[PDB]
């Protein structure tokens, strides 16, 4: 698999320090790993830094200079962006791209991202909540139940039922930022409501930020 | 951002759509453009590079041209799969950056109107007895993805402790969004339901729950 693995991201206090890293899979070595992109939630692409070779030099946004340093190493074909004096508005997810020159330049191939959080507000798990399947609301052969993903921060959290064994129904829902500042979800599945008295409903939620992981069963009434 | 595209564009299936791009000299002039295409919440993909090359899988009906300080994204028989924000870039040698239009999201039209589903879930037992109280609104498969919540505490109603998520389009194609009250014990335990209100299209579904004590 043709793929750019991103690390070194999270939650750091104003003022702090994160190393970013993009290591190259299924690709040899051709200078092109080279490019750093971000993100702020709702806003566009904007590039941040990137590095030339053979001869090592290291271009920069105005936004970031003297505070990022962007470095590889050649021989383990691993980018990296040294994050120093990390302020609020650098809060985005970070993206490195392949960049390459044939008549012009062009980032072919993109890492997943990794979400750099600036805030002084420390991690906290999700409180987690059953959705009881209704007496009433069962439509008929059908019953909704879920689980509520309460008051965590930062994202993102995982939801999986029955430890990955059920995938059919399920819709988790995309999180509402509370003014709060923390983040809630609900998962729901609907499933057969003659299942309900035998079969058994855990929604598996991981809060990788706060390491927290927290397995709440799901029964009527 | 530095180059200027037009926020939004829109066609029904199967037509055809274009998305212009504007620079300077130091930019677009000089510098070869490409065209990203960003599905919500994934990583951007490479459609278009030196100004009209396909990256290898594109297909044909993705086009690029540039002419002086302005490049063109055509993109023809429309599909609801081609529904992403598309972003132009290049390298200014004013500033020594890549630069990158603010985007443009292409909107398919003419897609079947449907009406939204709503379950309401009341206060869980387990967060009642942490002194808290939170209906859940749970509001999927509409179209358009545009739907306003109005929730009632018993007839009248409550704006207060509202929490909405901008609507999302589900992997159906259609659009999911969430709202949340957040109430007292004392309040949920005072009335004889509570009710969320969905609007769609001039038409309102409404679902209510009441304390089961
Ligand atoms: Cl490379």
């Known amino acids: 698999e043709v793929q750019l693995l991103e690390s070194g991201g999270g939650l750091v206090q104003p003022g702090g320090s994160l190393r970013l890293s993009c290591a190259a899979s299924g690709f040899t070595f051709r200078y092109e790993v080279a490019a750093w992109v971000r993100q702020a939630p709702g806003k566009g692409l904007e590039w941040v830094s990137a590095?030339?070779?053979?001869?090592?030099?290291?271009y920069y946004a105005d936004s970031v200079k003297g505070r990022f340093t962007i470095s590889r190493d050649n021989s383990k074909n691993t980018l990296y962006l040294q994050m120093n004096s990390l302020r609020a508005e650098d809060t985005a997810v970070y993206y490195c791209?392949?960049?390459?020159?044939?008549?012009?330049?062009?980032?072919?191939?993109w890492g997943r991202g990794t979400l750099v959080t600036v805030s002084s507000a420390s991690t906290k798990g999700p409180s987690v909540f059953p959705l009881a399947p209704s007496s009433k609301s069962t439509s008929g052969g059908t019953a909704a139940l879920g689980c509520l993903v309460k008051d965590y921060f930062p994202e993102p959290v995982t939801v999986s039922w029955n430890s990955g064994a059920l995938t059919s129904g399920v819709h988790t829902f995309p999180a509402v930022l509370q003014s709060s500042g923390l983040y809630s979800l609900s998962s729901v599945v609907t499933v057969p409501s003659s299942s309900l008295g035998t079969q058994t409903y855990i929604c598996n939620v991981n809060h990788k930020p706060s390491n927290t992981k927290v397995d709440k069963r799901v029964e009527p009434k | 951002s530095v180059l200027t595209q037009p926020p939004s564009v829109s066609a029904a299936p199967g037509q055809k759509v274009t998305i212009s791009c504007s620079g300077s000299?130091?930019?677009?002039?000089?510098?070869?453009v490409s065209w990203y295409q960003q599905l919500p919440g994934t990583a951007p993909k490479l459609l278009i590079y030196?100004?009209?090359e396909r990256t290898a899988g594109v297909p044909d009906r993705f086009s690029g041209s540039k002419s002086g300080t302005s490049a063109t994204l055509g993109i023809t028989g429309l599909q609801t799969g081609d529904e992403a924000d598309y972003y132009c870039?290049?390298?200014?040698?004013?500033?020594?950056?890549?630069?990158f239009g603010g985007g443009t999201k292409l909107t398919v039209l003419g897609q079947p109107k449907a009406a939204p589903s709503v379950t309401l879930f009341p206060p869980s037992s387990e967060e009642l007895q942490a002194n808290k109280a939170t209906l859940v609104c749970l509001i999927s498969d509409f179209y358009p993805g545009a739907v306003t919540v109005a929730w009632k505490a018993d007839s009248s109603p409550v704006k207060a402790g509202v929490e909405t998520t901008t609507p999302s389009k589900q992997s159906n194609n259609k659009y999911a969004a969430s709202s949340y009250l957040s109430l007292t014990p004392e309040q949920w335990k005072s009335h004889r339901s509570y009710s969320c209100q969905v609007t769609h299209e001039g038409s309102t579904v409404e679902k209510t729950v009441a304390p089961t004590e």
């Open positions: 791209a392949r960049l390459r020159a044939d008549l012009g330049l062009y980032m072919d191939l």
């Open positions: 030196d100004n009209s």
């Open positions: 000299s130091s930019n677009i002039g000089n510098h070869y």
């Open positions: 870039g290049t390298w200014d040698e004013l500033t020594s950056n890549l630069v």
């Open positions: 590095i030339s070779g053979p001869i090592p030099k290291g």
